[PDB]
Structures are given as C-alpha cells and as structure tokens.
Write a protein that binds this ligand. Structure first.
Ligand SMILES: NC(=O)c1ccc[n+]([C@@H]2O[C@H](COP(=O)([O-])OP(=O)(O)OC[C@H]3O[C@@H](n4cnc5c(N)ncnc54)[C@H](OP(=O)(O)O)[C@@H]3O)[C@@H](O)[C@H]2O)c1
Ligand SMILES: NC(=O)c1ccc[n+]([C@@H]2O[C@H](COP(=O)([O-])OP(=O)(O)OC[C@H]3O[C@@H](n4cnc5c(N)ncnc54)[C@H](OP(=O)(O)O)[C@@H]3O)[C@@H](O)[C@H]2O)c1
Ligand code: NA
Ligand code: NA
Lengths: 319, 318
C-alpha cells in the first residue's frame, strides 16, 4: 500500500531518479538485462525506462503493473506482450513536440546549406588560406516538402515550414481534415510530387523500411531526405546506394538502424548531415520528459489512471 | 559598348553576363595603383566588398557602381553622390535565403548541433554514449530584432511559427505589425534574452552592440549577428563570453574578415560561420543577375533597377 518499488534499468535522466522518492522506492540495475535481476527484486510494481526493455526483463516481474517509457516513441517496449499481461505502458507526448520540430528545421537547414561544414572550414583556418567556403549547391528556396507523418510533431514541423515560404504536402494512412496541406494516399506518390522528404512516423512494423529504393528514386535528383523519426523506417543500405549514385541530392539523419553505429559509407559523403539522436536533447525538454515519466507513475499509483497511456493500453489500475 | 571595371573576386555569373552589353576590364585587387592609362574611359564598376575612394576616383567618366550585395558599406556612397555617381545594390533576391541562414545559426547556437555532429563523426557516440544535453533551447525565449527591414521582417515571420515572443528596435517604428517596438537598443536588450542583429554597417550602428547592451541582454543571453561585424564591439563580446555575462553567440560576420580572433574560436558555446548567409548557388546566381541587370537597365534606359536611397539618380549621357 505505502511505497511501490520502481525498477530503473540502465541510464536515465537524473531528474527521474530525483523525483521517484516523492512516492516510490527505486531499484537500479546497470543494464536492461534479466540476468541482473535478484530474488529481492521480485516485488517490483513499476518500471521507468529509456530505450529497450527486453521481454525477459519485463517478464522477470510477476507484480509489474506499469512501464513508464521515457520518450514519445515506445518501440523499445514490447507493447503487445505488455497488453497481453494487462500492463499499462505510458509515453511522453506533447512536452517535446516543439523541441523536436526545432531540431528537424535545424537539421534541414544544415543539410541544405552545409552550415556545419562551413563552420569547420572556418575553424580549420581555411577561410584565411583558401578563401570563401564553397557555395552550397542546394537551398530551401523553391522547395516542395513532403511530410511522412503529420501527427503532433509532423504538424509542428509543417507550421514552421509555412513561414519559410515552401509548398507542403503529407502522407498518413488517414487524411487530417481542416488543414490546407496536400494529402497523398501513398508515400511513393508523395515522393514523386516533392523534392524534400521529412520522416516523422513511429518505428512500427507498418513503417519498417518504408523509405526504400523506389521512394528514393521517386524523390529524385534534387531530392533531400530528413529523418527525425526512427532509423528503422529508412532502408539504410538503399540510402547509401542512392547517395553514391546521385539518385538523391542529400540527406540529414538524427536516427539510424543500429545506433550508435553509423556505417562508414554514410560518414564519407560531403552532402550529408548526421546527428546522434538529439532531437529532444535540451536540458529544459529532457527535464519535462523526466517530469512526465514520474507524474505518470504517481497518477497511476494514486488515482489508478495514467496521464499519457499509449493507445495499445487504455488500462485502469486494479489492485 | 560601355566599359565595366571589375576589381578583385566576383561571382563568374557576373563575368559571364557582362558581354551581353559591355566590355569588361579586370584588375586583380581593388587598388588604384593597378589602374592603367588605357582604363581611363571606364563607365561603370561591378564590385563585391570594398571600393576604395582612390580607385573610384581614378575614373573621370564613371557613371555607376553596381554593388554585389544588399549591404553597400564598402562603397563610399557620400563621395559617389557628390560626384553624381549612381550606386545600386541587390535587395530582395537574397531576403529569404539570409533569413533561412539566420534561423539555422540561431538553432545551431542554442542546440549545439554542429558540436553534436562532431561528437558523432569523431566516434564518441559509440565509445562514450550520448552527446551532452544542450544547456540552452529556443523554447520559452524572447527574441529582439535589431533592425526590422526586408531581412529582419523575414526573420520575424519565421520566428512567429516557432512560438517565441518577438520585439524589435529600429529608429522609426513599423506600423501595422503586432511586434513590440523598443525606442532604444539597450531597452530592448533588457526586455529580451535573444538579440538578432540585422542592420546595415553604417556610422550609426558602429559598435552599437557594446558592453552595456550585452550586460542588459543578461546571463541567459544569446547574440546572433547576420548583419555586419562592425555593428558588434567584438572585444566587448569576447569579454562578455569569457565572464559569463551572456550565455552564447552565433556570428556570420566579423570586424576584420576573414580574421576571427583566437579567443572567439576557443568557446564551446559559440557558433561561427564564414559570412555565408546568402551563399547558395541559386541565391548568388540571382544576386549576380541583379548586378548585371542594373548595369543593363542604366545604360539602355537611364533608370537603374535597384539604386540605393542615397543616389536616386537618372542617367544623363555625355
Ligand atoms: N529523433 C528523436 O529524438 C525523436 C523525438 C520524438 C519523436 N520521435 C519519433 O517521432 C514519432 C512520431 O511522434 P509524434 O509525437 O508525432 O507521434 P504521433 O502524434 O502519433 O504522430 C504519428 C504520425 O505518423 C503517422 N503514421 C504512423 N504509421 C504510419 C504509416 N504506416 N504510414 C503513414 N503514416 C503513418 C500517423 O498517422 P496515421 O496513424 O493516420 O497513419 C501520424 O500522423 C515517434 O513515434 C518517435 O519514434 C523521434
Ligand atoms: N551576412 C550576410 O551575408 C548578409 C546578407 C544580407 C544582408 N546583410 C546585412 O543586413 C543588412 C540589412 O539588410 P536589409 O535588406 O534588411 O535592409 P533594410 O531593408 O534597409 O533594413 C534595415 C533595417 O535596419 C534599421 N536600421 C538602420 N540603421 C539603424 C540604426 N542606426 N538603429 C536602428 N535601426 C536601424 C532600419 O530601420 P530604420 O531606418 O527605421 O532605423 C531597417 O529596419 C544589410 O545592410 C547588410 O549589411 C548581411
Ligand atoms: Na520528385
Ligand atoms: Na534581458
């Protein structure tokens, strides 16, 4: 009744750890690994986690009620298996929307105008010896942007893009009514129509390698791909080929198939910007994400209703 | 065919198009000592950057200086006006491009994206894990625009979509816009935490961003300069960054380009670009076209396309 025990496997923002003592006992393990679970941990009622939650770790806890996922994406939790056990899963929507949308525009501008490379040119002393940084072959001016995904974050990206004077289209499974953006019922169809593709869908079975050779070919030789969603959504091998052959003109990636590993071939290109999954990674936004993780757990145990349960687990607490 | 002097470096598109109507005369530096007796019939100049007065005054038949760039502080416009010489610039065709760079630089300064990319490229994501969280963010910021002209307004339009508060300082307020006007720069700096400089480099803006303005901007303060480097007291900025008087800075322009002081290079909270705000192929092509089309319009019709405010002149031949 009094204090529930919460497991935290691996690294998490210290703000989560700082706030859990408001209601909970915290149990830490150094890695998300079932082999680290001891007999004394079998009474754990909740998990707070960033990234992967292996099924054998989740299933090591007979009294588990709730997984509070740090992040709006929760593809590291086996939600099917959670639902089958009656375990509620919560995520962190909304509190990071604007931050992520800001990073998406930054990455887009860096990709098109080569601003990081320009800064390196200056910092390495090349402005003095060799003169002006080369003119960027690309620009945002005159571009047509297609958003793959138009949810919380996709719409926030579209709102920014409206102020840059570019045409905007989108592809989702179901159109969003009331908005003045051109809907495309197929991804490849949108890709044909646009020269700039921004990926902001979840990493599910339905989006797995959706950005493939055909979509990239359709995007075309002025084509720029921006991925701020999940790396699984892009066929990473096909992207490398497309960049090698000049099938597309450039790419900016915050996410990858097998993080933190980025293939050497992607690192070679002068027309590519790469970030280590930083789209929400400010102090203020990660603090808000931490707060929402903890407030989800507090709401669950005190009222029986989570703040932001995921669609797959619209559960209420039975105790 | 009028003879056009081009001193020093210019976009090859200018040089490609001048033969449509003109004879081109090249000198390798903007230096009067390189002018020969044969060049004394030159009717026009096309120039990027500085045009020294002794070079300008080496040409008795000079009619027009077509400046490459919307900024024309490298031309002595007072002396040009006193000789009846029209000066043209390249407004409008670079406005959106420059506004794009201003936002890019702002985001890079706040979120440390270039440094995050370096962390990845140097193999640190694999060995040491996540790039450190950026202490700063755009979220919750209040932006003050020093200058709100063609480019300043285009920047404000972008910022409106980022959900930040917007204020501005100009000598005269702009009516009809919903942004908070400040009659003094220091007053705006007190009210905001993010200062974007987009004024021309004139006597009136010279070191306007000084120790007092930076102190007023405050310890969460971020300075972005995409105007001219002369507008910022570069020495005072270095001191302010050293002392923690402000939180960060993003600079596209500097007091003595291409030289950037070593102290500015040292800071982890600073983004630096080599004057790239308009430097795309498409935008520089449009700037080149406008330089040439100004000269063509002047010599064919007697009316320039984009003369500067100081020289609202029409051609008198002979
Ligand atoms: N880089 C980062 O650090 C970072 C940060 C935050 C989020 N993210 C990623 O961004 C994702 C989206 O976040 P959000 O808050 O915007 O979520 P959201 O509000 O649920 O939006 C998801 C969008 O994707 C669309 N979608 C899903 N499956 C689709 C499919 N198979 N085909 C076409 N459209 C599809 C949805 O429309 P329909 O359902 O109608 O198809 C919806 O428009 C997260 O799941 C996360 O993986 C990454
Ligand atoms: N980094 C780059 O590559 C790059 C590219 C393009 C332009 N620029 C620079 O940006 C400048 C602005 O371009 P623009 O097309 O926006 O020019 P603009 O349309 O003439 O706008 C200039 C703005 O500055 C204000 N201003 C001028 N002197 C001022 C003073 N002493 N105090 C306060 N406000 C002052 C003007 O308002 P008031 O007259 O009412 O004071 C006006 O709002 C250029 O002159 C150039 O130096 C740099
Ligand atoms: Na296309
Ligand atoms: Na302030």
């Amino acid at each position: 009744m009094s204090r529930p025990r919460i497991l935290v496997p691996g690294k998490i923002n210290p703000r989560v750890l700082e706030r859990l003592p408001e209601m909970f006992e915290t149990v830490r393990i150094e890695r998300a690994d079932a082999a680290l679970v001891t007999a004394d941990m079998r009474d754990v009622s909740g998990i707070a986690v960033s990234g992967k939650l292996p099924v054998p770790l989740m299933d090591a806890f007979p009294s588990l009620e709730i997984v509070a996922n740090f992040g709006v994406g929760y593809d590291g939790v086996d939600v099917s298996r959670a639902a089958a056990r009656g375990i509620v899963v919560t995520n962190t929507p909304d509190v990071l929307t604007e931050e992520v949308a800001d990073t998406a525009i930054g990455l887009l501008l860096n990709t098109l105008r080569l601003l990081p490379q320009a800064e390196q040119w200056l910092r390495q002393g090349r402005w003095v010896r060799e003169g002006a940084f080369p003119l960027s072959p690309l620009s945002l001016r005159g571009r047509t942007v297609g958003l793959f995904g138009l949810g919380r974050i996709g719409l926030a990206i579209a709102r920014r893009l409206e102020a840059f004077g570019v045409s905007i289209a989108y592809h989702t499974r179901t159109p969003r009514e009331g908005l003045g953006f051109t809907y495309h019922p197929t991804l490849v169809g949108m890709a044909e129509a646009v020269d700039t593709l921004i990926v902001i869908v979840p990493g599910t079975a339905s989006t797995l390698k959706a950005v493939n050779a055909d979509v990239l070919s359709a995007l075309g030789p002025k084509g720029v791909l921006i991925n701020v969603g999940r790396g699984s959504t892009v066929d990473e091998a096909a992207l490398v080929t497309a960049l090698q052959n000049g099938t597309i003109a450039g790419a900016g990636l915050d996410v990858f198939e097998n993080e933190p590993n980025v293939p050497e071939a992607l690192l070679s290109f002068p027309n590519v910007s790469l970030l280590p999954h930083v789209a929400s990674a400010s102090v203020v936004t990660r603090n808000a994400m931490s707060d929402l993780v903890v407030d989800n757990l507090k709401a669950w145990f005190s009222t029986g209703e989570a703040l932001t349960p995921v669609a797959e687990t619209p559960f209420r607490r039975r105790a």
